[PDB]
Amino acid sequence: TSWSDRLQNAADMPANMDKHALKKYRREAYHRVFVNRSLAMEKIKCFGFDMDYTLAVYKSPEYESLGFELTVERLVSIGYPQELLSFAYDSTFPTRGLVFDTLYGNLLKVDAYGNLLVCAHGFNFIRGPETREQYPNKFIQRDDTERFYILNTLFNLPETYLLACLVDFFTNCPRYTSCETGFKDGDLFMSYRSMFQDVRDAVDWVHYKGSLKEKTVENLEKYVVKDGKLPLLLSRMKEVGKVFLATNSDYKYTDKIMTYLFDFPHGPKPGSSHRPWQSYFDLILVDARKPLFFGEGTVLRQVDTKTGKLKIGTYTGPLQHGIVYSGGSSDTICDLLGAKGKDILYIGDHIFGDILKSKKRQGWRTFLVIPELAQELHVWTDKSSLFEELQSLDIFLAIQRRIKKVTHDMDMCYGMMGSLFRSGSRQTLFASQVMRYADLYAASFINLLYYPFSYLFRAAHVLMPHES
Amino acid sequence: TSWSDRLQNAADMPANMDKHALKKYRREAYHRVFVNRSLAMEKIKCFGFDMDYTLAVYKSPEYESLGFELTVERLVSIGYPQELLSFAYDSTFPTRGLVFDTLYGNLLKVDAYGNLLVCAHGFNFIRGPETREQYPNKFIQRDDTERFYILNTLFNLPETYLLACLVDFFTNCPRYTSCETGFKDGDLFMSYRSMFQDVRDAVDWVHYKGSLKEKTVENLEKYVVKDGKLPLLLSRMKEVGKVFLATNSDYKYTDKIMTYLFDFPHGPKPGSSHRPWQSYFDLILVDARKPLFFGEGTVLRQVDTKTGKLKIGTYTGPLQHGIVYSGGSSDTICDLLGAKGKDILYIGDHIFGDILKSKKRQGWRTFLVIPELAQELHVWTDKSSLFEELQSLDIFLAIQRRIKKVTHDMDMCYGMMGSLFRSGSRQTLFASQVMRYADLYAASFINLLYYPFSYLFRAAHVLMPHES
Amino acid sequence: TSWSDRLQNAADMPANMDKHALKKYRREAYHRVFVNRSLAMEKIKCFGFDMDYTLAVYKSPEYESLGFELTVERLVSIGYPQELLSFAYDSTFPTRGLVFDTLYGNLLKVDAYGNLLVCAHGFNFIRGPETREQYPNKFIQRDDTERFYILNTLFNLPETYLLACLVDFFTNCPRYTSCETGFKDGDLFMSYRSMFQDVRDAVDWVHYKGSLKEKTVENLEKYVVKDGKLPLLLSRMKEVGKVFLATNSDYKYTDKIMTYLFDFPHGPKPGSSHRPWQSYFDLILVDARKPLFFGEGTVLRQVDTKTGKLKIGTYTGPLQHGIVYSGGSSDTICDLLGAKGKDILYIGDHIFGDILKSKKRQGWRTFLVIPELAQELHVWTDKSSLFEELQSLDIFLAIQRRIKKVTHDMDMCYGMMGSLFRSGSRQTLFASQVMRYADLYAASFINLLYYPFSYLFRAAHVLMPHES
Amino acid sequence: TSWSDRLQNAADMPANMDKHALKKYRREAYHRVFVNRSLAMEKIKCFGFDMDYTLAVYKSPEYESLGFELTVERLVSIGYPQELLSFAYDSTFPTRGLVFDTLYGNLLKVDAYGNLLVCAHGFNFIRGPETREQYPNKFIQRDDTERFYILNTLFNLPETYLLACLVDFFTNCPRYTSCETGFKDGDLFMSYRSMFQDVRDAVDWVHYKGSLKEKTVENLEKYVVKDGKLPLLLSRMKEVGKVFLATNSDYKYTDKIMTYLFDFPHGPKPGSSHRPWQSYFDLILVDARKPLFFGEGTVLRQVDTKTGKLKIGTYTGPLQHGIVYSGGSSDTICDLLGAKGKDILYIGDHIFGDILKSKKRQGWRTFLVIPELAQELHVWTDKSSLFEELQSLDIFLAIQRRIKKVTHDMDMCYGMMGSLFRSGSRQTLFASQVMRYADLYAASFINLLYYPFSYLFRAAHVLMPHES
């Protein structure tokens, strides 16, 4: 009973649209929208969406195994050793947002300042003192993107596990010899860095040229959460403003997935005519290339919706009923929807390209979807007085072992790599970017349905130490 | 009665080093050290210092007029119109940390997300609606450093006022014609951008080639706060660890200033032999070139202390009693003092080059000195129930004019450009970087003297919305 | 009767290895090696080869049609209009080395200084005065590689013709409207630049992912010149030094092509055992990535010759009998063959990546293969007294129309875009790079067979004006 | 009897403007204009000039000692050892155009392909075999500008000698220890690279901030060649076209120098009113910043000619009688003089910034002034049958020691570093750029006076090997 089970449970009940019962629904935390900076929904004019892991939520672990298997295969297919084929995806290992150190082949879970919180090498969890040999100040320069990778998104889950599998594998294959920075095999030396590259290449490959999409769209129920309430909310959004899709995915794939998400024997609400997915949007934009989308963008194109091929040249015309865009930029959406940024709420799951960049570069309002938040919330309250015990032991410091021990037992409930948002008392870089960049966040955007359209989402004013 | 008056008042009383009276001293807020992230002083091994506006605090407005006058002069000297000479520095105008928009020649005071809080053009304070013509989403892309300048440090005070003077001047000189982006004068067009460049050039000029230093060191009492307690604290620091100076200033100037700061008829405490300033440091480094200092650095050199000229070539020897370094990097200091970063507390006033970069790039502990914090703290409590009234009006929103009105009356107490750390209920980008990068901060580092050496500076653990 | 006909004619006669008959063979110009800077063959220790259009010479126009057809198809396949399919490759149009101006969609044939010699738009040959509207100083900045493309190699022949086809097509399709910089079609605007990109993408596509290789290797006799003398020369080279292959092509393709080039019922000379192509080389290197190969290179890999896949990691071992390399750099070849540069003769057809860069970056000796030189040499002597007449009319200038007229009649004999090496009296950029970078050059490297191994290739010493 | 003696000899005779006597004057080689590519003077519309070492030719060795002395002094002044003061400039050492290798501290004289022709370390002339330890292929990558410097211009003469002085000095001072790449002195290591930087800094310093200009303009007759014929030629140029000055020098200095060049008790010809230097130009542009001038340029400014200070802002007006420009670009000159490039003849002495870049980037016609060409031409004919003997010994190679010997005796006549344009039979990189970029060249532009205005300067058409 993972987190996509929770979402497909929530998904399976029709909304009681009675006002009283909505207020009580969104009392339970799995259904709350959480506020980081106040936001007056009255003033949002356009709602805009990402697709993958936002509107279309890939069932777990099923989808991650598929990615993993396909990547394992690709790699064996280009000459990595047969033993990889015997690997099998373990959803209890990877937590999202870890940084992969390509110098020493460690997975690292870090705070906002790049302080080490957990360091794993293969599957050996390197303890405090022993990490000082490689990180003498228990810290990593987060900005050194040549060395540190950071696996931010749920697509990175398979690779997160895979990297740990490969490191452990070679550490323990007597054919290879460990070195500080990689493995020797006679006359061939494979550094963790180039190893890591190979994994990245292979994951891209299964996405853009291999069989992930193809295997996905032929078993949508296996891999993709479907929720009656989705058409309802979008329809409700379009009643008070403008609704738009801007997604990195291409049109053809976007079409297969969205069709499915709307495939119900009715429209927004039981008993109404089914209308096609496109009718739910005032502007549809694909091949977005976020985060570049939030800067110079790319040349604006028109999609020929029959073929699914792009028309030839640069689209210079206006927003017409039926048109579909490819590329362009976030200004395209602004000009065309006659919106300036704080007018818009952009809803997506990518902490960097969907959230951080639209806020920083454009002044857009932000809603971050976090799937795991479903499971993480069961664990947070199931185990609440374990945490409250940790809060107590820190406060009594006015014995250190019992801290590090309790912390461990806590993190363990979450997975081998702990909560998404913290390691014991200390918050992760990911938690830290949620609070800082995501104005609102939830386990799923569908949680918006439970708030009235005029709702005022309200966060407490921050005070500086010297102001208290 | 400004803020350097407060510091020279505090400076003028000898420390009562009785333990009880120290605890009570640092109760009053002007003397508190404020904590943003917990820090156990027991574990700091090296204390390191900036000089300008840290150890040597330039008396205000005297020092700022001097800078301003010298810059005004330089500019008239390269052909700017005589009328500039009649300008005169106004300490009630500029607040530090404003961003100068070189496209439209506005001073802008912004929050962490680059939202407009105050916008001034020349001296005309552009109100809400009218700012939308130029900033249609009431926001600026903070990362667009080609366009936006940001005047971060107390050295920037003179230029902050100067830029407003120049814009207002030309707006109203009938010889020139206003344009969106600058001024026409017959066949010459001077954009705000190139205007701004000229000001920057001229300020650098008076610092590196003009008479600022020379006029300063010949009237140190006029321009530089001197405090008996300084030698005392450094001496106390050296008793429990290592003490180091790493400053952007060159040696000669560093020597004149530091000599003065130690010029008392005694040592660390009344009745003891006066020892020279260098004896207070285990490592002295000049020509630091921060923030580059916190990256690749520059080639490490040795200062010939007789001449004050650099020796020829790259210093490869060890830390020797008496040696003075030039350039190098922050690793130089780490290797040589046998320190890893969290061991160190670096104390300085530059929010970017001293604080943000040492934390981000090196994992160094940080103490930010903020002079204005002295005055800003009188105003914060003198006017406390005005603010508490603002907190009330926001909360009653569950009438808008009364918000914007009260906000105004509040900010006005601070200056024309308001508090350093906020504009009414909303925090500035500067406030936001203090909390995020500066582990400790105070009106002056001397506030450290009032805490025991084993003190545990303690900040409350952050919780995410969904965790509460 | 083109130029690959000439080579397959020369190819089809066995070498008379009698010394007297060799001296007389290489008297006729099609068989000469031409010298630009003296070179003592006695001192060359390693001969090194490119493959495509060097050792393996693609029959013309057959190969070019194939490329063209495949590219035309690709483009229609991504949405370019059906009419392209009716195009058909015209070998009498393109001359190699033209520059494509992506601003205005012209093919330009230029001298070393980028002076215009011929300018064609679609198929309209823009005359003198009319070119001044777009090139007011009859010149182009050759270094402006963002704007100017330059189609240098015989692979570029199909695209050279294709670009002219497309420009002419749209100029004259009433569905589109000409503009200075591209074509409007309702709301879509396709600039020549982006048009040009599409063509480039499509040519790469048929090479790396489409069916060019696949269609080629299944009809080698159709597409690839085979010459008994090739194994003979290589064998003769290996008798006096070291022989190496360093090619951009991957191993699999390199294997199919080279096998074929050596597919004869005998070895180097009629009656001897056939030996496999690899035995002819002391070092075999593929995936060369020239010209980067002549700088930092890429990571050195080993080819697993059974699979044709790369082994995993970086090859650190020595040169072993049987080994095949991938990537690396030109230093790899130097270290491993124990050669410094002037020791080596590198033989290839790419004026930039094979010749200019190895000379400039490494001090390697150079032999440039130029296929067209076969046909161009028939034309040069067939029409010799036309040229000698042009030389006369220039000299009598001490009437202008007769110059421009004779020039035309001359260039026409070569093709629509004239000789490779000149336009009337004036030399091309290509000619100019041959003389400057290619130490020796010939219609084919096989011309080396006709010179003794100790031969001294001898060019006249240059004198400066003031020295004569 | 150097080369500036020759020019001041030529300078001192008034021109016999009789047509017959002009034709005979320009028969003698010191007075010839040499042609690299034909040029019809009938078609030049604007003549444009550099100043330093073009119109104003600094007397040698006097000027070079001054530069050298001033640089030596600067360096001792920043801490280089006293012994430098005892150095003294030796005009028989440096030849222009040498490359300084900052890795190993060698002066290198190279051909166009960067082949070594002479290599000196300090003053030790490293012979053939011994150079192979450091340059194993007797070659340098010319494009590696991080390592190789190249001292191109007559201003570089002092530094050329200075670098050799310093290297020799430290090689032989027992206080220092030689290393491959620099010198150790206890704990200080000074690499040749950083040494070289120091020299460069110091030369810039004496030019922009030290006393070179100031000492120069107070003894113009000592340092600057003055020639009656100069006003005559410019006046003659202005009669048939447009005349312009575009110089890197600032206005004030440009004014002192040009005033002097025109300081005669008459105008263009004895007996006419003296007119001021500015009247000789249709466009005057200073602070040119060549070669950037030949690209994006800089912002166009107007000079206030009373003060010599720049007016404030960007000049947008038209070409007005009396106006003086600062910065801008080469398009400024083109637009304003209504010229496209081949219309213009630009006359200057900088092989890169004056000649190579205007030709390559703009299609401008070029005249290169080469002062040394005066002396080099005495030596070329004084010693003609020594060279003709070298030509003979090369040809008889169909004994090697006698080549290298004769070469030596030849080069020696020129200086320690040989002719500017060759080392024995082999041409320098400098010679090679003259022929390739400089359409015309002469010992001085005054040689133009001896050609009629309609003259056709005529170079022989180049033929490729295979065309002969």
Ligand SMILES: O=C1c2ccc(S(=O)(=O)O)cc2C(=O)c2ccc(S(=O)(=O)O)cc21
């Ligand atoms: O450059 C980044 C990037 C840089 C730094 C971080 S972070 O330190 O975790 O905030 C995070 C990121 C990213 O998450 C990311 C995602 C996608 C791209 S893309 O290739 O331009 O599309 C670039 C990036």
Ligand SMILES: O=C1c2ccc(S(=O)(=O)O)cc2C(=O)c2ccc(S(=O)(=O)O)cc21
């Ligand atoms: O590049 C910056 C800089 C960039 C961005 C900001 S900030 O947005 O206010 O944090 C702030 C800054 C700075 O405060 C600053 C201070 C000194 C230099 S220097 O010329 O490299 O020494 C660069 C900088």
Ligand SMILES: O=C1c2ccc(S(=O)(=O)O)cc2C(=O)c2ccc(S(=O)(=O)O)cc21
């Ligand atoms: O950058 C160039 C290039 C630049 C300039 C010229 S040229 O002006 O004709 O000499 C010619 C060229 C080339 O011919 C060429 C061929 C292949 C590459 S690659 O993409 O790096 O492999 C780059 C280049």
Ligand SMILES: O=C1c2ccc(S(=O)(=O)O)cc2C(=O)c2ccc(S(=O)(=O)O)cc21
């Ligand atoms: O970048 C160069 C440069 C590069 C290469 C050569 S060359 O190899 O001798 O042709 C020569 C040169 C130069 O002669 C030169 C002169 C002045 C400048 S400046 O600092 O931009 O003004 C740059 C340069």
Ligand SMILES: [Mg+2]
């Ligand atoms: Mg997403």
Ligand SMILES: [Mg+2]
């Ligand atoms: Mg400071």
Ligand SMILES: [Mg+2]
């Ligand atoms: Mg080739």
Ligand SMILES: [Mg+2]
């Ligand atoms: Mg010059």
